[PDB]
Structures are given as structure tokens and as C-alpha cells.
Design a binder for this molecule. Structure first.
Ligand SMILES: O=C(O)C1=C[C@H](O)[C@H](O)[C@H](O[C@H]2[C@H](O)[C@H](O)[C@H](O[C@H]3[C@H](O)[C@H](O)[C@H](O)O[C@@H]3C(=O)O)O[C@@H]2C(=O)O)O1
Length: 486
């Protein structure tokens, strides 16, 4: 027995966890065996290993009505709230009060996070992934390519065009100026012509503009930005396979000495300098401040969230609600944050000076440390309290200089934190928003690739947003916002 045991009798719980369109809970994960060893709760993965769409899997699972004991994963918040209210998950408030001292104490100290995750009925239907940190993504450019071509790091959008055009036309390596492992980043490019693409680290999020709730993709600023993005795409400044390359884009495009420029996270993006040192002679990425946009400002639209829309819930089928909440509580305690952030003691880390310290092999490894942790069951989107010291330990000094530059320059835009809708308001949001958003993404794709001309289609686009309920959503969001702020 361990001090962390939540039951004396071993308990197997069925988990449906399908995430990032690729992965399921793997009971072979060292971290999962370590979770079992420390908690005496074993998880049994029932999600389809072959499926390549996480959100449809959750939906089909719900549809089938063959529910497991626990459901977890990414971008589940809205569904945890909707299906919890409908009786598929149980509320957690009273379970937490009585049996989850760590989650309890976390919510009491973070009342804005509690508030962000509650359903209109005041119920907590899930335990969230809680990030730790300040900045998220930044702009990175090939300084070795800047040198080769004798070009200054670009200071504004006119200069960025000129630099990227030069990566294209002058063969600094087949050269592909902009690449990204997140296709949504292509739309974030509208930032350079003074348009938002999001109000938060969640892509295609709402924002507030002088106390008006707006969607960035509805705005004519977005229209004009997108006409430039399509042009850049037409010119091959953007990876032709931007929408399909995905997760391994950096391994492929930087490793193969093809990619010049990206917008990604500081810790992992900057490890490629050490990692690709043997295979690509003199590969050097530098963090750059966001080149000034057409409106005369330097925008970093992205920031680390106080709570992400990911985590896990307890289904109606769970015959062991009490053991389960105690199992969730583990990941909000020191030893649970240890394994879920650091991996396995004696394998990927050891306790030194009262804290988890990654081993030398983990730190010197060419793979980003978070990628190493994914492969073993850690830094995955269950309900857990992230510890930024895990990240600090593999943040290079060069990555840290870049962050400090972002912090000093005040480039990071304030994030949208959500609104607190009533039952009726949130019902409209739930009825429409998913659909609206998928249409927006499909339209944006069409504009970027040149399938549709932004100007000839902007009006039918507005028409569509209207009959797809977007403006009805915004009005309900505006009502909730005004109740709270104005
Ligand atoms: O890459 C880093 O340096 C880094 C440091 C932090 O400790 C986190 O690990 C941060 O994690 C990101 C990770 O970079 C990816 O962005 C992943 O992205 C998923 C998003 O959360 C969305 O769900 C998206 O639709 O899919 C993304 C994907 O899987 O690529 O999420 C984590 C995160 O924020 O936890 O990276």
C-alpha cells in the first residue's frame, strides 16, 4: 500500500479517453502503471484506437449510450457541461466538498477557475486540465537563413513579406517560408493586418471590444486580412500542406532544412537548436518580437490560459463515485502532480531538494521533453494541475531570453476569459456554436487555398453566419457579459 491509495481494494475503472485525433489512454504507459501503483485505481481504456477524430468518438460513445466510468480528453468542456446537465455525468460539487481536499483547496484559492468551469446549474461536471505559465507561443525565424541571405530580422509586416519572399525566391536551403504544426496558425496570420483571429489560446474564440462581445471571424478586418493570407498562400509563402501536415511539421520541415518561420511554443520550438545540431549544420532559430502589423502594433494574440477546456468527468454509470473523485484528487496533490507532470520516479525524474528533477538523459535528449512525456502518459489532457517547473527545467537560456523579451515588450494581448451564461443563454450557444465554427473553418480553408474568392463570397458568408445562429449566440453572450461587467 502507498500513502496515496484511494482504496484498499483495487478498483478497475473504464475510461473513454480519445484525444488530439490520434491517441487513447494506454494502460502500457509507465505513467498509467505508476498511477495504479500510487492510487490502487487501474484504468481500462475502452476508446477506439483506430479512430482519427476525437470529437466524433466522444459523440458516438454518447450516442451509443454504452458509457464507461470516466470520460476525459481535450476540448471536452462544452460537452461536459451540456451532457452533465442532461444527466450523462454526475455533478462533482458535493463529492469534492466531502472527499477531494486538494481539488477543494485549489478551487478555493482559484475561484475564477471554478467559475469558468461551472455549468449554468452551478454544477461542476468535470475536473480541468489547469495550465501553469504566462506566455504561450511566439514567432521564430531561421537566423542561419537570415545570415546566408544577409537580411535583418524583420521588424514589420512589409519587412516580413520581403524576408519570406526571399526565403522563397533565393533558395536559403524547395524552401517553404512559413510552416506550422497547428493549421489554425495560418489564420492567426491575419494579426499582421490588424485583425484578430481569436480572443484566446483557444482558436476561433470570441473576444471583447469596448464591452461588445464579438467574433473575430465575423469582422471585416478579418475579411481584408484573409485576402493577404490567400495571396501569401498563392505565392507559396505558406506551406502548401499547411492544413494536413500537422503534428510532426517541425521534425519534417526543420529537420529536412525546409522551413524558415513559425509561430509556436517557446520551450519546444527552441529545443530544435540543440536537437537538430548534428543533422542540419548551423540550424538556428531565434525568437523575434512580433513584426509590427499594418496598424502599427506588435501583437502576440496567444497567452497561456488559467484553465483549458480539457479534463475528465464521472459518468452516470460509475458505481464508485467516491473512489473516483479521490482518484481525481490525487492529480491535484504533490505526488499526483509529480507523475502527471514529470513521468515516473527513477525513470524520468528523481526527488531532489524536495522537488521533482528530470534526469540528465531526459534533459539532453533531442526530443522536446513534453513529447517525451506524452509518449509515456504525462502532460496529457486529464484533470491535473500543471507545474511550470517541469517546463522551466528544459527551457533553454535562449528560450528564456525570448520569453523575457515577450514579457518586457508587453506584446501578449489580454485573453478572453469566458462569460457566465444562464441555462437559456448557454442553450443557444450549445445549439449553434459548434456548427457555426466548423463552417467558419471550412470557409477559411477555402479562402486560404483560393477555392473561393474572399470578396465575391463575403456577403453569402455573412448571410450564412446569420442563419447558422451566430448573431443569436453573440446576443446571448452579450446578455451574460452585461450582467457581469456593464
Ligand atoms: O510546446 C511547448 O513548449 C509546450 C509547453 C507547455 O508545457 C505545454 O506542453 C504546451 O502544450 C501544448 C502543446 O504545445 C500543444 O499545443 C497541444 O496542443 C493541442 C491544443 O491544446 C489544442 O487542443 C489543439 O486543437 O490541438 C493541439 C495539439 O495536440 O497539437 O496542447 C498543449 C497544451 O496546451 O497543453 O506546449
Amino acid at each position: 500500500k502507498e500513502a496515496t491509495w484511494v482504496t484498499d481494494k483495487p478498483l478497475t475503472l473504464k475510461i473513454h479517453m480519445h484525444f488530439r485525433d490520434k491517441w487513447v489512454w494506454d494502460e502500457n504507459w509507465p505513467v498509467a502503471k505508476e498511477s495504479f501503483r500510487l492510487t490502487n485505481v487501474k484504468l481500462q481504456s475502452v476508446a477506439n484506437k483506430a479512430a482519427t477524430n476525437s470529437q466524433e468518438q466522444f459523440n458516438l460513445m454518447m450516442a451509443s449510450g454504452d458509457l464507461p466510468d470516466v470520460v476525459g480528453g481535450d476540448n471536452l468542456k462544452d460537452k461536459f457541461i451540456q451532457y452533465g446537465q442532461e444527466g450523462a455525468f454526475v455533478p462533482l460539487n458535493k463529492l469534492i466538498d466531502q472527499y477531494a481536499p486538494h481539488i477543494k483547496a485549489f478551487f478555493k484559492s482559484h475561484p475564477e477557475v471554478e467559475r469558468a468551469i461551472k455549468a449554468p446549474d452551478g454544477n461542476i461536471y468535470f475536473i480541468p486540465y489547469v495550465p501553469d505559465g504566462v506566455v504561450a507561443r511566439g514567432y521564430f525565424i531561421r537566423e542561419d537563413w537570415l545570415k546566408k541571405l544577409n537580411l535583418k530580422p524583420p521588424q514589420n509586416i512589409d519587412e516580413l513579406y520581403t524576408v519570406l519572399k526571399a526565403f522563397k525566391e533565393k533558395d536559403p536551403n524547395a524552401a517553404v517560408p512559413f510552416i506550422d504544426r497547428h493549421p489554425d496558425e495560418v489564420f492567426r496570420l491575419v494579426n499582421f493586418w490588424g485583425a484578430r483571429s481569436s480572443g484566446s489560446d483557444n482558436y476561433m474564440d470570441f473576444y471583447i471590444d469596448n464591452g461588445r462581445v464579438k467574433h473575430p471571424w465575423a469582422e471585416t478586418a478579418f475579411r481584408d486580412g484573409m485576402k493577404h493570407v490567400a495571396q501569401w498562400y498563392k505565392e507559396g509563402l505558406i506551406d502548401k500542406e499547411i492544413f494536413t501536415r500537422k503534428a510532426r511539421a517541425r521534425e519534417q520541415m526543420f529537420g529536412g532544412n525546409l522551413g524558415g518561420f513559425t509561430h509556436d511554443w517557446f520551450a519546444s520550438t527552441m529545443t530544435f537548436n540543440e536537437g537538430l545540431a548534428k543533422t542540419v549544420p548551423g540550424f538556428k532559430l531565434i525568437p523575434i518580437a512580433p513584426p509590427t502589423n499594418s496598424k502599427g502594433q506588435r501583437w502576440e494574440e496567444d497567452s497561456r490560459q488559467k484553465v483549458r477546456p480539457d479534463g475528465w468527468a464521472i459518468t452516470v454509470k460509475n458505481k464508485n463515485p467516491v473512489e473516483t473523485i479521490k482518484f481525481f484528487d490525487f492529480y491535484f496533490s504533490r505526488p499526483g502532480r509529480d507523475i502527471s507532470n514529470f513521468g515516473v520516479p527513477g525513470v524520468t525524474y528523481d526527488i531532489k531538494n524536495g522537488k521533482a528533477v528530470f534526469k540528465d538523459s531526459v534533459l539532453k535528449s533531442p526530443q522536446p521533453v513534453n513529447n517525451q512525456l506524452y509518449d509515456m502518459g504525462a502532460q496529457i489532457p486529464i484533470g491535473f494541475w500543471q507545474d511550470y517547473d517541469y517546463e522551466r527545467q528544459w527551457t533553454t537560456p535562449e528560450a528564456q531570453a525570448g520569453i523575457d523579451m515577450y514579457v518586457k515588450g508587453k506584446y501578449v494581448m489580454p485573453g478572453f476569459e469566458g462569460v457566465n451564461m444562464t441555462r437559456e443563454e448557454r442553450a443557444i450557444y450549445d445549439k449553434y456554436w459548434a456548427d457555426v465554427r466548423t463552417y467558419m473553418y471550412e470557409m477559411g480553408q477555402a479562402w486560404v487555398m483560393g477555392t473561393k474568392d474572399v470578396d465575391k463570397t463575403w456577403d453569402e458568408y455573412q448571410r450564412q453566419l446569420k442563419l447558422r445562429g451566430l448573431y443569436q449566440v453573440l446576443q446571448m453572450m452579450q446578455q451574460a457579459y452585461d450582467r457581469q461587467y456593464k
